[PDB]
Write a protein that binds this ligand. Structure first.
Ligand SMILES: CCCCCCCCCCCCCCCCCC(=O)OC[C@H](COP(=O)([O-])OCC(O)COP(=O)([O-])OC[C@@H](COC(=O)CCCCCCCCCCCCCCCCC)OC(=O)CCCCCCCCCCCCCCCCC)OC(=O)CCCCCCCCCCCCCCCCC
Ligand SMILES: CCCCCCCCCCCCCCCCCC(=O)OC[C@H](COP(=O)([O-])OCC(O)COP(=O)([O-])OC[C@@H](COC(=O)CCCCCCCCCCCCCCCCC)OC(=O)CCCCCCCCCCCCCCCCC)OC(=O)CCCCCCCCCCCCCCCCC
Ligand SMILES: CCCCCCCCCCCCCCCCCC(=O)OC[C@H](COP(=O)([O-])OCC(O)COP(=O)([O-])OC[C@@H](COC(=O)CCCCCCCCCCCCCCCCC)OC(=O)CCCCCCCCCCCCCCCCC)OC(=O)CCCCCCCCCCCCCCCCC
Ligand SMILES: CCCCCCCC/C=C/CCCCCCCC(=O)OC[C@H](COP(=O)(O)OCCN)OC(=O)CCCCCCC/C=C/CCCCCCCC
Ligand SMILES: CCCCCCCC/C=C/CCCCCCCC(=O)OC[C@H](COP(=O)(O)OCCN)OC(=O)CCCCCCC/C=C/CCCCCCCC
Ligand SMILES: CCCCCCCC/C=C\CCCCCCCC(=O)OC[C@H](COP(=O)(O)OCCN)OC(=O)CCCCCCC/C=C\CCCCCCCC
Ligand SMILES: CCCCCCCC/C=C\CCCCCCCC(=O)OC[C@H](COP(=O)(O)OCCN)OC(=O)CCCCCCC/C=C\CCCCCCCC
Ligand SMILES: CCCCCCCC/C=C\CCCCCCCC(=O)OC[C@H](COP(=O)(O)OCCN)OC(=O)CCCCCCC/C=C\CCCCCCCC
Ligand SMILES: CCCCCCCCCCCCCCCC(=O)OC[C@H](COP(=O)(O)O)OC(=O)CCCCCCCCCCCCCCC
Lengths: 61, 54, 141, 80, 75, 124, 100, 230, 152, 100, 93, 62
């Protein structure tokens, strides 16, 4: 069984799709995973309201 | 299952050897030996079952 | 369930008053010694006799309530539990569907009818000569 | 609560999705889904809107049509 | 070996101890027929009050076969 | 009131019984951590509050007060000519509010008013 | 003439023959504000139909005075003369059924 | 053996917050009031940090204590709205026959009820993920879009309403009830802007509090819609 | 037009342009669309929980466009709200004990105008501008500005 | 897993309470003999008669109510100076011709 | 007789169902038209035309510069204030 | 930003003359639902007349 990169090939049809379709599917997959989600990762890690409460507190030995 | 009266032995539909219903099975030859006549209708049934003269 | 209850929906600590039913009684049983037979007079009290970890069942309850917190896999609950966990969520979603596909259509029809006949289709046409749409909930008139 | 069994009697698995082959009819699938996720939420969620809509729209006949022929002092025309 | 899908297993019973939980006799698990009879009456009163708007203003003229003291003269 | 946990407590069926109360008493309790202790605390509370004869007098007083309260509220809404929940009459000028004026005279002559007014000669 | 003639015809008649007694529609309550507003609305509707000079409308004003304090009547009578009294706006220029 | 409770012996935020409150009264400029509000926000956030740092005590009763406080607060929010509903219905006998234009029952109520319902669905999905130890980034931004639209619609309504607060107690009650709901909507923004995934998961009181509050506000709008629009 | 697929498959493929349907019908594809940190907890989920979550998420996201349509129509309605009759000043209408200054306790802008009475403020701002005092707003025609929702 | 409230408490006490309220109200109306027929109109008899005359064509269409009273306030005198019902009817007639 | 050749399951299912539909539409369509349920673009009812014929977009009267009509013979102000003349920043035509 | 963007725009005509409104009730009260583009254009021209910039603006044809 051939395994394609995640999110790049549809399982709904034996036909992979036409050029425009493939472009839309590949590029949405890239935009979500490597462009849009930059904002979410940035907010989750660099601006955590709960991490900021423990800023400057000694480590727990 | 249905190995004892408590488990359901002898209860139709609950016992594997007893069917829920017992409709008569179809036959293709009459008991006389004649072939079973076959009729195909193209009009709804007569109102009272009233037979029509030969 | 959403709200935390120490007795039933205790998800903060996961404490359970009784052991799992899967365990044999010889392995673990609920802490209940109310049926203990009368103590012979020649027996002497060694322990405190105080309700606590000296009792085997209570000890095992405490031990299990801490060692159950690490498990190799999930204990899949049945579909009845899963439905109850998100009962409100599913019901609100169906409420949204009703508001879009039931409330939406007849509300639109009423406004369109109101445009032509001045009053909604579920109201009594007036003859007083006053102007405007008037009431909408006719059963609260 | 009262411990009870799972009431879902439909098909537990359709098999692996192979380009949508060997699958039930769409309406059968919708019914199986609601069976799997519970009809109590469907009835509970839609109940409020159904009640409100039935009452308001019922006025089309109970409050408007009937009323047109309800006033007993209206059928009488003047100078007749 | 044979197994059971956990998603379709039955709910576990309450433990039987000195402190046992029992909801079987409460009858509060689900709405009963009486509740649905209340809903039916509510629908009926709602329709009736609108269909027959002169019911609250009845006629005092009464004939009543077998007089007024016969049981079918009270309904 | 039994003193041994082995001896069961009798419960009726319904929505306010010994079994119904046991199911809900320890829902928010951090002290009922095992069957033996839970039952002991449950019976302790039941013995103290439900086997106390004078406590039942207050149960009567709350019922009577609440029943009067619910009924006076309901009566205002259902019969008082000046309480409006429907809007038909409130969308008309005062001279045209015939349906609301129908409540006036029946509401002006309650039974107790007719029964007790003759007894003014005990105050004057 | 009939003993129950007052109740017959209108509920209004009762206070018209007995100006200083309770009106049947408001006797249940000690507060008589609503009674004053009905009486004023009735004076306003009389003038529209009969004019100010008619003895009937003059008496409908006396009836309004019986239950309405003068400071309220003077204010409400000015609004009426300007054309801003909400109890006297002609019905075809009312906005009560508009936008809701 | 340790003590059952790690007692807090001293605190200085209380003095600051109480002084901040006084500035609202003892001031000669409304700009001072704006900046004073920022000081309040800052110090209330410090108190929240103290609550998060109390997690180090590993006290089982802390979750329960905070949860029940929220219950009491929600109760106080419900009873304040009741007081406004009371103020509204007390003067009900003077409504619907005055020369004012009351609100339509078609446009505002429907789009608002549809909007607020979607807000509930988002929060519900957040709860579901919270249960499943999962996160979806887009969820919070859907809330921001919903809040933006709600703010956009309420602003236009007020500006284009042809009746003012001084026209009738009906109009005053309409504006005040709607404003009170909006304030509680804005408080929801204040709470939701910090939503993130915390790895201590279901021992975090924030998650349960948000779910309860959002449901309260949406339910409160159902009551308002029936009273005023329908 | 491709003939290597059925009509149903083609429609489903296009509805799967963003991969929604594929993630529903493949557990592996759903877990590999999660960011690695949250994929760690995925193995514990039941298929019931997974598809129910997608159903709630999909229903919500598919109704957002509808709410957006309803909100746009609302903005257009408010943007072209019909004029209403000028209110007659009734017995208990427009009562004032003091000027409106709670918004500007010290500046006391538009003391006679009500807090959101836009037409009164416009004329009041014009007086201030005629008095050499600048005020913001009420100067651009609605049809010449963006986001007005009043354009034909 | 232990239950505190009725299994269907929310729907039960919501719909149930509504049902009891509705049924109790019908009972209350019967005991007081309240008329239950909804009238959406005003009851000013003289006004309703003028409206019938308009529907019968006795009074020209779009004639204002202040053009028919026997007493006019100041604001209605202002309006009467600019009132032209005949012109209004002609304008409406022109609109109909253009539309068709 | 001689129609039996036609009489058939498919010919019957499309005759009962199809005929039932033929009467459902023939009897329901007039009701939908009367109650304004039909799409406007497909057809306009006579009541719709009667109302629409009364609508025009050329009325330029009634402009006032005050929030209240306080009665009297003067009425609300109708003249733009002098301080407001020429205060609009209209883009060049 | 919502507030600032709205504050710049001239106020819509909330109210008109009481009498003139009721003499053309149907057109004004229902014009929007029957044809919103022409109603929008009519409103714009009235705003241009109410604020004296009619000769300085060209209102796009509908
Ligand atoms: C200007 C305005 C004009 C307005 C016009 C309005 C017209 C309105 C018409 C309304 C309908 C009229 C006809 C009603 C049915 C009549 C039934 C009949 O004759 O009863 C015999 C019936 C059969 O007795 P039986 O002898 O036991 O059974 C027959 C044999 O035993 C054999 O036993 P079996 O078990 O084999 O048979 C069981 C059953 C088997 O039943 C059937 O097979 C039913 C008939 C065939 C199907 C018909 C179509 C059904 C479609 C349903 C769609 C639903 C959606 O038997 C029968 O039904 C026998 C009679 C069959 C013919 C009945 C008439 C059918 C007419 C169909 C017309 C369809 C095309 C219309 C096109 C219109 C175009 C515009 O007798 C009873 O049941 C006794 C009834 C006693 C009480 C009577 C109360 C009367 C009130
Ligand atoms: C030939 C025929 C001729 C004609 C004949 C006509 C005959 C009459 C026809 C009419 C029918 C009559 C029927 C009578 C018998 C009915 C028996 C029956 O089945 O009733 C029960 C049936 C359902 O009751 P059930 O069996 O208890 O429900 C079963 C559940 O599945 C049990 O499951 P569950 O309890 O677990 O359910 C799920 C539950 C699970 O929930 C929980 O787990 C509990 C949670 C509780 C706390 C919730 C927290 C707060 C909420 C958070 C989420 C908020 C989201 C939304 C946010 C909105 C923001 C704006 O979730 C919920 O329910 C609530 C959460 C979901 C979202 C709630 C949304 C807000 C609700 C509140 C507002 C409602 C009003 C909205 C108005 C519009 C908008 C303003 O109720 C009704 O059908 C209603 C009453 C019907 C009778 C009265 C009808 C009067 C009018 C009749 C007129 C008809 C036309 C006449 C024409 C005449 C011409 C002559
Ligand atoms: C008018 C405006 C009304 C505004 C209503 C606002 C509601 C906001 C919250 C809505 C919400 O999220 O509810 C769903 C959610 C459903 O809970 P769940 O655990 O998922 O329910 C599972 C099943 O429904 C089955 O659950 P279960 O039946 O097994 O029982 C678990 C659940 C059952 O409860 C609920 O689920 C509550 C549902 C409320 C729905 C309201 C609509 O227990 C709780 O959640 C208990 C919460 C604490 C209640 C504390 C009550 C304090 C006041 C007591 C009276 C004091 C004065 C006495 C004076 C007279 C003396 C003689 O409710 C909560 O978790 C919120 C609880 C706190 C609400 C406080 C409201 C103010 C009091
Ligand atoms: C052999 C048996 C055959 C049976 C066939 C049954 C056919 C049933 C067809 C039902 C069609 C219902 C159409 C409803 C259209 C409503 C359109 C509408 O109003 O759109 C606008 C409205 C919102 O308008 P606003 O401008 O915002 O105004 C209101 C709020 N202020 O939008 C909505 O309501 C959105 C929801 C639209 C729902 C459309 C429903 C369509 C249902 C089709 C059912 C088909 C069933 C077929 C069964 C076949 C069985 C063999
Ligand atoms: C969920 C599905 C959708 C449901 C949609 C419902 C929409 C409308 C809801 C409105 C609010 C709820 C009440 C509805 C009442 C409907 C019937 C109705 O119109 O009732 C009118 C009637 C009086 O009307 P009028 O004729 O104008 O007055 C005459 C002189 N008094 O008012 C009522 O009965 C309703 C108002 C009271 C409701 C509550 C019942 C009264 C008693 C309250 C007791 C409170 C204390 C505690 C009680 C505890 C339990 C015993
Ligand atoms: C199905 C849902 C039903 C919900 C029913 C809820 C019932 C709650 C009732 C609580 C209070 C009951 C008090 C008894 C009823 C009296 C009603 C009454 O008389 O109302 C009018 C009278 C005012 O009139 P007067 O003072 O005489 O003159 C005013 C002149 N401008 O009383 C009021 O003001 C009623 C105020 C209470 C209304 C709000 C009650 C609480 C609402 C809770 C919402 C959640
Ligand atoms: C408001 C005051 C509410 C006080 C009672 C509830 C407090 C509460 O639960 O806060 C904690 C709770 C979660 O903290 P945990 O670390 O999980 O729990 C603390 C230790 N177990 O914190 C929050 O709710 C987050 C608050 C963030 C927003 C704060 C905004 C303040 C706005 C002030 C405006 C003036
Ligand atoms: C925190 C709450 C902040 C609220 C800010 C907005 C206040 C607001 O809009 O108030 C105006 C609003 C509507 O009044 P009018 O402008 O007269 O309505 C005419 C419609 N054209 O209500 C008020 O004036 C009451 C304001 C009370 C104080 C609000 C701030 C606290
Ligand atoms: C604070 C205000 C709260 C809201 C308003 C409260 C109103 C009063 C309280 C109502 C609470 C109801 C909750 C729902 C309970 C429920 O559904 O309860 C349901 C129960 C049945 O229980 P089951 O579900 O177990 O069957 O209903 C009944 O007991 C009645 C059964 C049907 C009876 C039909 C015939 C009734 C005839 C009545 C005649 C009345 C005549 C009156 C003359 C004066």
């Amino acid at each position: 069984v051939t395994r394609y990169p995640s999110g790049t090939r549809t399982i709904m049809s034996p036909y992979p799709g036409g050029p425009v379709y493939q472009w839309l599917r590949i590029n949405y997959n890239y935009f979500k995973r490597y462009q849009w989600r930059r904002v979410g990762r940035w907010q989750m890690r660099s601006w955590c309201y709960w991490k900021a409460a423990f800023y400057g507190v000694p480590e727990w030995n | 299952k249905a190995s004892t009266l408590a488990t359901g032995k002898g209860i139709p539909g609950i016992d594997p050897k007893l069917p829920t219903h017992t409709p008569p099975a179809s036959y293709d030859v009459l008991s006389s030996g004649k072939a079973r006549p076959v009729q195909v209708a193209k009009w709804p049934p007569m109102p009272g079952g009233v037979p029509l003269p030969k | 369930k959403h709200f935390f209850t120490d007795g039933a929906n205790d998800y903060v600590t996961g404490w359970e008053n009784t052991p799992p039913l899967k365990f044999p009684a010889s392995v673990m049983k609920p802490c209940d010694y109310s049926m203990t037979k009368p103590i012979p007079k020649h027996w002497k009290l060694r322990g405190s006799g105080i309700h606590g970890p000296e009792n085997t069942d209570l000890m095992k309850l405490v031990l299990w309530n801490r060692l159950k917190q690490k498990r190799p896999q999930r204990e899949v609950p049945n579909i009845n539990y899963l439905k109850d966990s998100i009962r409100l969520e599913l019901s609100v979603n169906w409420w949204l569907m009703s508001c879009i596909f039931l409330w939406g259509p007849w509300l639109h029809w009423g406004q369109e009818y109101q445009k032509v006949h001045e009053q909604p289709p579920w109201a009594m046409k007036r003859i007083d000569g006053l102007r405007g749409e008037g009431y909408f909930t006719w059963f609260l008139e | 609560h009262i411990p009870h069994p799972v009431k879902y009697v439909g098909p537990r698995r359709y098999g692996r999705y192979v380009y949508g082959m060997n699958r039930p009819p769409v309406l059968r699938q919708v019914k199986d889904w609601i069976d799997w996720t519970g009809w109590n939420s469907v009835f509970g969620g839609f109940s409020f809107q159904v009640a409100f809509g039935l009452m308001i729209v019922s006025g089309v006949y109970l409050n408007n049509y009937r009323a047109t022929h309800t006033l007993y002092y209206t059928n009488k025309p003047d100078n007749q | 070996y044979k197994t059971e899908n956990p998603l379709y297993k039955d709910d576990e019973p309450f433990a039987k101890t000195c402190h046992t939980f029992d909801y079987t006799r409460e009858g509060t698990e689900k709405n009963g027929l009486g509740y649905y009879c209340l809903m039916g009456l509510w629908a009926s009163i709602f329709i009736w009050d609108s269909l027959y708007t002169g019911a609250t203003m009845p006629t005092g003229v009464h004939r009543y076969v077998w007089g007024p003291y016969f049981p079918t003269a009270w309904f | 009131p039994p003193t041994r946990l082995s001896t069961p407590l009798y419960s009726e069926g319904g929505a306010f019984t010994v079994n119904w109360w046991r199911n809900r008493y320890g829902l928010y309790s951090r002290r009922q951590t095992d069957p033996m202790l839970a039952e002991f605390l449950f019976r302790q509370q039941v013995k103290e509050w439900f086997y106390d004869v004078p406590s039942y007098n207050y149960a009567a007083l709350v019922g009577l007060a609440l029943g009067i309260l619910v009924a006076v509220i309901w009566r205002h809404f259902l019969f008082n000519p000046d309480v409006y929940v429907r809007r038909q009459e409130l969308r008309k000028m005062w001279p045209d509010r015939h349906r609301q004026f129908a409540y006036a005279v029946p509401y002006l002559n309650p039974q107790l008013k007719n029964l007790l007014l003759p007894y003014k000669n005990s105050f004057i | 003439e009939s003993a129950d003639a007052l109740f017959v015809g209108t509920l209004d008649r009762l206070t018209a023959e007995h100006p200083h007694t309770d009106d049947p529609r408001f006797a249940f309550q000690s507060n008589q504000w609503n009674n004053c507003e009905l009486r004023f609305t009735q004076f306003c509707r009389c003038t529209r139909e009969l004019g100010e000079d008619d003895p009937r409308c003059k008496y409908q004003y006396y009836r309004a005075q019986t239950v309405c304090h003068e400071f309220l009547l003077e204010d409400w009578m000015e609004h009426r003369h300007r054309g801003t009294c909400d109890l006297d706006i002609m019905p075809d220029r009312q906005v009560i059924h508009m936008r809701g | 053996f340790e003590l059952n409770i790690n007692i807090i012996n001293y605190n200085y935020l209380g003095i600051i917050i109480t002084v901040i409150i006084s500035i609202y009264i003892y001031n000669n400029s409304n700009i001072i009031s704006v900046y004073n509000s920022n000081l309040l926000l800052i110090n209330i956030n410090i108190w929240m940090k103290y609550n998060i740092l109390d997690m180090l005590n590993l006290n089982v009763l802390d979750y329960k204590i905070l949860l029940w406080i929220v219950v009491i607060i929600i109760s106080n929010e419900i009873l304040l709205f009741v007081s406004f509903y009371w103020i509204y219905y007390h003067n009900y006998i003077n409504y619907y026959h005055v020369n004012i234009l009351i609100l339509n029952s078609y446009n505002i109520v429907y789009n608002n009820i549809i909007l607020l319902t979607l807000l509930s669905t988002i929060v519900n999905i957040k709860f579901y993920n919270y249960i499943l130890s999962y996160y979806k980034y887009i969820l919070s931004y859907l809330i921001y879009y919903n809040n933006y639209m709600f703010n956009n619609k309420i602003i236009l309504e007020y500006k284009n309403n042809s009746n003012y607060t001084n026209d009738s107690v009906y109009m005053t009650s309409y504006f005040y009830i709607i404003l009170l709901h909006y304030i509680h909507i804005y408080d929801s923004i204040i709470l939701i802007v910090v939503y993130n995934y915390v790895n201590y998961k279901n021992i975090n009181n924030y998650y349960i509090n948000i779910n309860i509050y959002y449901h309260l506000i949406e339910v409160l709008y159902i009551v308002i819609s029936i009273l005023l629009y329908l | 037009i491709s003939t290597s697929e059925t009509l149903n498959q083609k429609i489903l493929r296009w509805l799967d342009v963003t991969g929604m349907l594929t993630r529903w019908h493949s557990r592996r594809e759903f877990i590999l669309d999660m960011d690695p940190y949250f994929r760690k907890n995925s193995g514990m989920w039941t298929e019931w929980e997974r598809k129910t979550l997608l159903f709630l998420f999909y229903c919500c996201t598919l109704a957002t466009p509808y709410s957006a349509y309803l909100d746009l129509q609302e903005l257009k309605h408010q943007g072209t709200k019909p004029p209403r009759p000028v209110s007659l000043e009734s017995r208990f209408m427009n009562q004032r004990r003091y000027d409106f200054t709670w918004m500007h306790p010290q500046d006391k802008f538009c003391s006679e105008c009500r807090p959101v009475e836009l037409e009164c403020k416009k004329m009041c701002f014009d007086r201030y501008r005629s008095m050499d005092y600048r005020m913001y707003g009420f100067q651009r025609p609605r049809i010449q500005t963006y986001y007005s929702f009043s354009t034909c | 897993g232990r239950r505190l409230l009725h299994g269907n408490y929310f729907t039960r006490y919501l719909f149930g309470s509504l049902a009891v309220i509705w049924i109790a109200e019908y009972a209350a109306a019967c005991q007081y003999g309240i008329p239950r027929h909804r009238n959406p109109n005003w009851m000013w008899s003289w006004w309703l008669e003028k409206q019938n005359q308009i529907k019968n064509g006795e009074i020209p269409a779009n004639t204002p109510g202040y053009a028919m009273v026997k007493w006019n306030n100041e604001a209605e005198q202002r309006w009467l100076k600019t009132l032209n019902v005949e012109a209004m009817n002609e304008e409406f007639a022109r609109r109909r011709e253009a539309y068709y | 007789g001689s129609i039996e050749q036609f009489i058939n399951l498919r010919t019957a299912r499309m005759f009962i169902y199809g005929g039932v539909s033929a009467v459902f539409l023939y009897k329901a369509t007039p009701v939908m038209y009367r109650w304004e349920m039909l799409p406007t673009f497909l057809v306009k009812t006579e009541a719709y035309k009667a109302r629409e014929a009364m609508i025009a977009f050329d009325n330029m009267k009634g402009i006032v510069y005050g929030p209240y009509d306080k009665g009297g013979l003067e009425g609300p102000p109708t003249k733009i204030p002098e301080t407001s003349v020429g205060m609009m920043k209209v883009d060049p035509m | 930003w919502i507030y600032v963007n709205e504050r710049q725009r001239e106020p819509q005509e909330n109210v008109m003359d009481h009498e003139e409104f009721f003499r053309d009730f149907d057109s004004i009260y229902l014009g929007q639902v029957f044809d919103h583009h022409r109603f929008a254009e009519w409103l714009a021209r009235r705003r241009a007349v109410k604020w004296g910039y009619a000769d300085q603006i060209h209102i796009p044809p509908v």
